C-alpha cells in the first residue's frame, strides 16, 4: 500500500534467490500498458527502473533473460489514475499468482485511516514459482540517465504488510459491497 | 442453462448492481438466485415459480 | 521415437525437494548430492539431474 | 528508513466472484 501520486512505484519483482540460478517475476507497470514475464532474471543488489527524461524506458533491473517461458500482457495496470491510496495483495497458491487492487481516496493525515475497503481481483496467472523473497521496483528519475551500476543517486512511502491463515466473518451491504470485517484470531 | 446451470425460474430483471468479476450470486442457502446474461450486460434475478 | 536413439527428451532424474502441483522447474544445474560445493562440472558428488 | 505502524480495519478482499 502507498499513497504516492509522482508514479514513483511501478512494479515488483518476485523469486527465491533472485538470480539466474532460479525462476523470477519480473512485473512492471508503464504508463500505457504492463509486462510480466517469467524468465531467469539476473537480479543486481539495487534493481530499479531508468527513465532518459518522457519515454524510451530502459530494464536494468536484470543482467540476462534466457528461459522466457512465460509472458503476459494486460495493459488494461495497478495505476488507478493519478489523482490517492492503491492497495494491492498478491497471493501465490497452487501456483498460481493473484493479485488484488482497490482505490481509495485519502482524506486525511499521513497515517492510515479508519474504516473498511475491501479490494478487488486484478489478475489471475499461473507461474509456478517458489516465491519466498520480493522487492518494490521503484523509478529514480534523476533528470538525467544513469548506468547499470548499483547505489545510484537515490538524493532526487510504502508499507509492506504479511499474510496469514486467519478466519473472517464478511458483512455485505444491501448493494453487495463489503462494509465490515472481523478476524476471529 | 446460461453456463451449464440447469434449473427452473422466473426472470425479473432486478435492479441489483453486479461487479465485472462477478456473474453468479446466491442466497442463504447458497442457491443461485441471480445470475448475469453472458450476451448481454443486464442482470436477471432466478426465482422459483409458483 | 528413432532407431538409432532419440535423445531430445529429459525427465530430471534428481532433484532435491519434491515439487510442488502444478509448477515447473526446468532448472538444468548440476544437482549437488555431496557436501562439497558442487563447482559446475561433473563430480563423484553432484551428476547431472537430467 | 523503516517505521513500524498497524493497519486497523484494512486487508480485506473478496474471497469468491459469488
Not at chain 3, 519434491?18 to 548430492?33: H, N, V
Request: net charge neutral; aromatic share 14%.
Amino acid at each position: 500500500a502507498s499513497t504516492e501520486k509522482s508514479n514513483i512505484i511501478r512494479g515488483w519483482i518476485f523469486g527465491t534467490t533472485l538470480d539466474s540460478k532460479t525462476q523470477s517475476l519480473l512485473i512492471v507497470n508503464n504508463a500505457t500498458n504492463v509486462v510480466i514475464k517469467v524468465c531467469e532474471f539476473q537480479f543486481c543488489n539495487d534493481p530499479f527502473l531508468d527513465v532518459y527524461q518522457w519515454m524510451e524506458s530502459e530494464f536494468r533491473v536484470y543482467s540476462s533473460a534466457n528461459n522466457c517461458t512465460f509472458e503476459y500482457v494486460s495493459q488494461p495496470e495497478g495505476k488507478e489514475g493519478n489523482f490517492n491510496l492503491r492497495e494491492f495483495v498478491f497471493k501465490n497458491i497452487d501456483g498460481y499468482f493473484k493479485i488484488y487492487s482497490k482505490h481509495t481516496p485519502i482524506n486525511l493525515e499521513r497515517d492510515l485511516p479508519q474504516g473498511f475497503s475491501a479490494l478487488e481481483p486484478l489478475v489471475d496467472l499461473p507461474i509456478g514459482i517458489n516465491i519466498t523473497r520480493f522487492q518494490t521496483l521503484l523509478a529514480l528519475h534523476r533528470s538525467y540517465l544513469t548506468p547499470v551500476d548499483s547505489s545510484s543517486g537515490w538524493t532526487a512511502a510504502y508499507y509492506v504488510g504479511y499474510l496469514q491463515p486467519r478466519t473472517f466473518l464478511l458483512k455485505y451491504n444491501e448493494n453487495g459491497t463489503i462494509t465490515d470485517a472481523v478476524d476471529c484470531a | 442453462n446460461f453456463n451449464g446451470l440447469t434449473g427452473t425460474g422466473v426472470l425479473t430483471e432486478s435492479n441489483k448492481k453486479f461487479l465485472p468479476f462477478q456473474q453468479f450470486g446466491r442466497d442463504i442457502a447458497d442457491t443461485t438466485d441471480a445470475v448475469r446474461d453472458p450476451q448481454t450486460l443486464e442482470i436477471l434475478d432466478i426465482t422459483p415459480c409458483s | 521415437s528413432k532407431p538409432s536413439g532419440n535423445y531430445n527428451y529429459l525427465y530430471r532424474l534428481l532433484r532435491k525437494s519434491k515439487l510442488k502441483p502444478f509448477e515447473r522447474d526446468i532448472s538444468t544445474e548440476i544437482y549437488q548430492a555431496g557436501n562439497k560445493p558442487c563447482n559446475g562440472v561433473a563430480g563423484p558428488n553432484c551428476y547431472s539431474p537430467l | 528508513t523503516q517505521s513500524y505502524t498497524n493497519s486497523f480495519t484494512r486487508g480485506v478482499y473478496y474471497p469468491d466472484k459469488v
